[PDB]
Amino acid sequence: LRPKLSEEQQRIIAILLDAHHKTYDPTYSDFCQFRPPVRVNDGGGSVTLELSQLSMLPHLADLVSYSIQKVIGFAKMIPGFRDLTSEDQIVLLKSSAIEVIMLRSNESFTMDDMSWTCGNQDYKYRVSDVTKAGHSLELIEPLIKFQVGLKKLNLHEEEHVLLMAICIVSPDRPGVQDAALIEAIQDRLSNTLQTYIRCRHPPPLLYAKMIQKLADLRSLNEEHSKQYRCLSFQPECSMKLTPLVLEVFG
Ligand SMILES: CCC(CC)(c1ccc(OCC(=O)O)c(C)c1)c1ccc(OC[C@H](O)C(C)(C)C)c(C)c1
């Protein structure tokens, strides 16, 4: 069966497309406002050296901080999100933040050279930049695997925005109070996505692959949390971050 999208489902898709267009600048025009990228010599990927310098950390922390603000804005526009309590909205945003950033970064991600191309050479980010921010291969290798696997799904913009909305509105996040309300909002989003794929995605299993990406994001979130904890032990690290990053990941 291929039921047509209801008027309400068509409205949800329009709302989410508009939300993404207002909160994701595909020209990356604000990036020059961040603390500048610094790329030192570290061909060997020396952990001691990367931790002693964290050369790319101020630029990447400003980029993540900016992205969290945009994600907060996108989330406020998800139909139903405003019906949740303030406490539940914050629990969902804090727990999903890194996962939504990983999803949204797929738009700048290119398989041409396995980089995140956000403008000129200064804003072209690679694995080596993430290591220069104090992260290890345990996060980097599954991160690139996730980006390639997601890129290969060739998602329509409608599917990409619904995936980010489903990611945020997850009833199984620790500390949630009204899990039933969150689940109701997510089911409305999931049904819209499932109906959209069946009635709009041409051939050549897509929904199950998308659900799998959400599970992959949980593993990446856990690995990122462990790595952030290690990074927080580096003296003077806090100054290289932002108050928003400190609160979200602390
Ligand atoms: C450079 C790679 C990456 C991938 C998600 C990134 C690339 C572009 C981004 O945007 C352009 C786009 O969304 O199109 C964002 C928003 C992040 C990233 C950036 C920083 C980072 O580490 C951050 C570090 O963990 C702190 C939280 C300590 C700052 C990690 C693991 C990954």
- Beta-strand ranges (E) seen in 49-182 are 109-110, 115-117, 124-125
Tokens 């039921």, located at residue: 3
**Ligand 1 contact via 56 beta carbon (within 6 Å):** no
The two three-digit tokens of residue 45, written as one number: 């990927």
Distances (CA, A) of 78 to 18, 81, 107, 185, 202: 10, 5, 20, 9, 26
**Ligand 1 contact via 64 beta carbon (within 6 Å):** yes
Atom 6 (ligand 1) nearest CA: 105
Atom 1 (ligand 1) nearest CA: 125
Q: Which atom of ligand 1 is nearest to the CA of 57?
A: 29
- Candidate CATH numbers 1.10.565.10, 3.10.105.10, 1.10.1270.20, 1.10.760.10; the one for domain 1-250: 1.10.565.10
Whether 2 and 197 have beta carbons less than 8 Å apart is answered as: no
Atom 12 (ligand 1) nearest CA: 105
Q: How many other C-beta atoms lie within 10 A of the C-beta of residue 232?
A: 14
Resolution in A: 1.5
Number of H helices, E strands in the chain: 10, 3
| 153 Cα distance to chain centroid | 16
Distances (CA, A) of 62 to 27, 66, 133, 244: 17, 6, 12, 10
Q: Which atom of ligand 1 is nearest to the CA of 125?
A: 1
Q: Which atom of ligand 1 is nearest to the CA of 61?
A: 29
Whether 146 and 217 have beta carbons less than 8 Å apart is answered as: yes
The residue extents of the domains of the chain are 1-250
Atom 11 (ligand 1) nearest CA: 105
Give per-residue burial for 99-126: e unless 16+ CB within 10 Å, then b: bbbbbbbbbbbeeeeebbbbeeeebbbb
- Beta-strand ranges (E) seen in the chain are 109-110, 115-117, 124-125
Q: How many other C-beta atoms lie within 10 A of the C-beta of residue 29?
A: 10
223 CB-near residues (< 8 Å, 6+ apart):
138, 139, 142
Residue 244 in 3-state DSSP? helix
Tokens 């207002």, located at residue: 22
Instruction: Tell how far the Cα of 62 is from the centroid of ligand 1, in angstroms.
Output: 9
